[PDB]
Design a protein around this ligand. Structure first.
Ligand SMILES: *[C@@H]1O[C@H](CO)[C@@H](O[C@@H]2O[C@H](CO)[C@@H](O)[C@H](O)[C@H]2NC(C)=O)[C@H](O)[C@H]1NC(C)=O
Ligand code: NAG
Ligand code: NAG
Lengths: 50, 49
């Protein structure tokens, strides 16, 4: 808790400065993939293939 | 499923070699036994027997 003062005719002014650095990270893409239905759904049975 | 192909790259299929021979491997004994004789038993026992 840090309450700021208030008055009719009072202001505040800085007299010095400094420089800082900051980092940010963003995803851009995912890993592609591919599938062939026949191999996965049916191993070798010819009747299954028909 | 058409006659005309536009330029680009396509994936048709995956090549698969097909089988040629059939192989069976079993243990090695060639003797008969009383299977039929157990079936053809003169007297048949009970469940408790
Ligand atoms: C403003 O602040 C900077 C620091 O952020 C002050 O510079 C430092 O001053 C002290 C006091 O002599 C030195 O020990 C430090 O080495 C100074 N910093 C650097 C990076 O050298 C600066 O003095 C302040 N402004 C005024 C007018 O005093
Ligand atoms: C500020 O001004 C108002 C009128 O504008 C007055 O009532 C008040 O007493 C003054 N002082 C403070 C501290 O608010
Ligand atoms: C079956 O074949 C194996 C390997 O040749 C041999 O070790 C074994 O004696 C054979 N059994 C019979 C009953 O011939």
């Amino acid at each position: 808790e840090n309450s700021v003062a208030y008055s009719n005719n009072s202001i505040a002014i800085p007299t010095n400065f400094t420089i800082s650095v900051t980092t940010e990270i963003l995803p851009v893409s995912m890993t592609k993939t591919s599938v062939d239905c026949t191999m996965y759904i049916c191993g070798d049975s010819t009747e299954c293939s028909n | 499923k058409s006659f005309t192909v536009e330029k680009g790259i396509y994936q048709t299929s995956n090549f698969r070699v097909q089988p040629t021979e059939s192989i069976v491997r079993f243990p090695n004994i060639t003797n008969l036994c009383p299977f039929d004789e157990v079936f053809n038993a003169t007297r048949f026992a009970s469940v408790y027997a």
